[PDB]
Structure formats: structure tokens, C-alpha cells
Amino acid sequence: VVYTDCTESGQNLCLCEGSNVCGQGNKCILGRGDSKNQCVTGEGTPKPQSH
Incomplete structure (x- = not known):
């Protein structure tokens, strides 16, 4: 299986923080500056990564 990094804000099932694979009950937000x-x-939402 191939997991990837979060591309949009509001997704979870991806590697958000360094290697942390966010899942259910959490939501990754890619902002700006140091809060990216x-x-x-x-x-959150399942982030598409595999067709």
C-alpha cells in the first residue's frame, strides 16, 4: 500500500506531521508560515492518492 502526504486541508489518512499517519478523529490542516x-x-477526509 502507498500512503502519501496531505495535499489539502481537511484530510487525515495521510502523513501529516513528519511521519504521522493521521486517521479518523483527526484532521490535517495545511496553513501557511510555520503553521503549514x-x-x-x-x-477529516480520506485523501485520494491511489486511483
Whole structure:
């Protein structure tokens, strides 16, 4: 299986923080500056990565 990094904000099932594979109950948000990648708590979305 091939996991990837989060591309959009609101996705979870991807490597958000360094190697952290965010899943359910979490949501990654890619902002700006130093706050460009974070696993915030809530509900994200499955990030498409494989066709």
C-alpha cells in the first residue's frame, strides 16, 4: 500500500506531521508560515492518492 502526504486541508489518512499517519478523529490542516501542517482534532477526509 502507498500512503502519501496531505495535499489539502481537511484530510487525515495521510502523513501529516513528519511521519504521522493521521486517521479518523483527526484532521490535517495545511496553513501557511510555520503553521503549514498540523494534525488538529475533529473529522477529516480520506485523501485520494491511489486511483
